Write a protein that binds this ligand. Structure first.
Ligand SMILES: CCCc1cc2c(N3CCN(C4=NCC(C)(C)S4)CC3)ncnc2s1
Length: 466
């Protein structure tokens, strides 16, 4: 049931009309997640999924959008009988949250590619009966709001989504799947994951959204991809404009990833009179420091990626060292594979490529090169120190001999007279990991002893018998 006041801006004929609808909704006591997700999904469908007939912008008529809204509300209200789940204190019960989750779940097509683009919004849920993992969580939160359950909110880590609810918003419930081939814990709390200090649950320093942050989530969720080679400029512009709206209203304050996404967009196409990408990456880091105990990994990866693309080797290594300094106080657990993949790619592909080019440019006479800077060698060492410390105490190991080949190569990119300048104290650098402490003498030697490095990084007990 859309209110008269919600309907007055239709039809939406442009990017800017969509921005106005968002502004209007964000100025209400409770922005309407269902309306907003349906609108975003409609426009994304007609700008990215099917552009046949497109001449400027896919006009969103009130009759179309209101009928989609009706389909959603009718589906939820008919399947979830609230009288069966008495609410005291204006708060929801775990049984009610589970029932809403089941309703969304049981609505989805039995089989589909769960990784596909453009299956994030309630437009996809209604028209395609498909949602991606975090899409299911969002749709549970949208359904709860539709039912009047003001206490149910989206919880987000850097790789997963669930809900919070209940007295003081203190309860957690799983409502969707995570990854592939994992067993789901739907209906359960996230306490076991928090207690094991996995990255997936951020030691409890995950995001607890209010309604405005849930709008920011749907905006981050917009996917401009038309195919592998092509983005919709219209959706990029829309996402960028909506992110700025949210930024100006204060609603990205506690949302590091959204700041990084806005920085990435500003790199591609800067908005005149706005902060530089670097300023925005730093605001993302500051957000993580202020609200989340500096326990997030991606704020530093966003920054490192920016410096990497710009071939600022020194600053990229600094930011990846800072990324490792966060991961060192985690336990590498089952289901943390995404972050392992990210670190593996940085160590074993991205850094090698950067240093290879740097070596060529040094041969060509570069001055101020990262390869002649002992502070950059220290950053490389701190990056490996955090990865080795991560591994300590973890229930599954991180390092192996594939990593050792690249470490030897990367060390070897720095001359001994540069490496010798780093002072490893118990540029000055302190190691936290036992692996790097035992490697200290090997690191500053004129010739790099590759076999001894390999043995130290992988703690291999023995060398070839015969
Ligand atoms: C999927 C549920 C967890 C979330 C991921 C995410 C998100 N991402 C945006 C894309 N991401 C990154 N892009 C570049 C990166 C530095 C590798 S991290 C991290 C994940 N953005 C905004 N909100 C959320 S909530």
């Amino acid at each position: 049931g859309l209110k008269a006041a919600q309907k007055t801006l239709f039809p939406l004929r442009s990017i800017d009309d969509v921005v106005r609808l968002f502004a209007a909704e964000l100025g209400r006591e409770e922005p309407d997640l269902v309306l907003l997700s349906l609108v975003l999904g409609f426009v994304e469908h007609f700008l990215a999924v099917n552009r046949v007939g497109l001449t400027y912008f896919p006009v969103a008529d009130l009759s179309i959008i209101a009928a989609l809204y009706a389909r959603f509300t009718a589906q939820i209200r008919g399947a979830v009988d609230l009288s069966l789940y008495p609410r005291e204190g204006g708060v929801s019960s775990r049984e009610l949250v589970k029932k809403v989750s089941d309703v969304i779940w049981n609505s989805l097509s039995r089989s589909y590619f769960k990784d596909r683009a453009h299956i994030q919004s309630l437009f996809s849920f209604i028209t395609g009966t498909k949602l991606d993992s975090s899409g299911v969580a969002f749709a549970v939160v949208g359904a709860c709001q539709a039912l009047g359950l003001r206490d149910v909110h989206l919880a987000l880590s850097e790789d997963h989504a669930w809900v919070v609810f209940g007295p003081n918003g203190e309860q957690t419930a799983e409502v969707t799947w995570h990854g592939k081939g994992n067993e789901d814990r739907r209906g359960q709390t996230v306490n076991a994951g928090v207690a094991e200090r996995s990255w997936l649950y951020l030691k409890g320093s995950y995001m607890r959204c209010d309604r405005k942050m849930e709008v920011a989530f749907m905006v981050c969720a917009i996917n401009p991809s038309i195919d592998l080679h092509t983005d919709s400029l219209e959706l990029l512009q829309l996402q960028q404009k909506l992110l700025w709206l949210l930024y100006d209203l204060g609603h990205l304050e506690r949302y590091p990833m959204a700041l990084g996404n806005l920085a990435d967009l500003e790199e591609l196409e800067p908005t005149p009179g706005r902060p530089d990408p670097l300023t925005l990456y730093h605001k993302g880091i500051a957000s993580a420091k202020t609200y989340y105990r500096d326990e997030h990994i991606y704020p530093y990866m966003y920054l490192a990626g920016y410096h990497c693309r710009n071939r600022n080797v020194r600053e990229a290594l600094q930011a990846w060292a800072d990324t490792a300094t966060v991961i060192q106080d985690y336990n590498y657990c089952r289901e943390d594979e995404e972050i392992y993949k990210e670190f593996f790619e940085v160590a074993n592909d991205v850094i090698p490529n950067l240093l290879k080019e740097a070596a060529s440019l040094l041969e060509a006479g570069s001055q101020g090169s990262a390869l002649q800077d002992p502070e950059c060698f220290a950053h490389l060492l701190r990056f490996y120190d955090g990865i080795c410390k991560w591994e300590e105490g973890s229930p599954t190991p991180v390092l192996h001999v594939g990593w050792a080949t690249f470490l030897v190569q990367s060390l070897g990119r720095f001359e001994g007279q540069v490496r010798q300048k780093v002072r490893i104290v118990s540029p000055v650098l302190t190691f936290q990991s036992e692996k790097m402490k035992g490697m200290k003498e090997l690191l500053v030697a004129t010739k790099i002893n590759s076999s001894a490095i390999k043995l130290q990084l992988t703690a291999q007990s023995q060398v070839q018998m015969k």
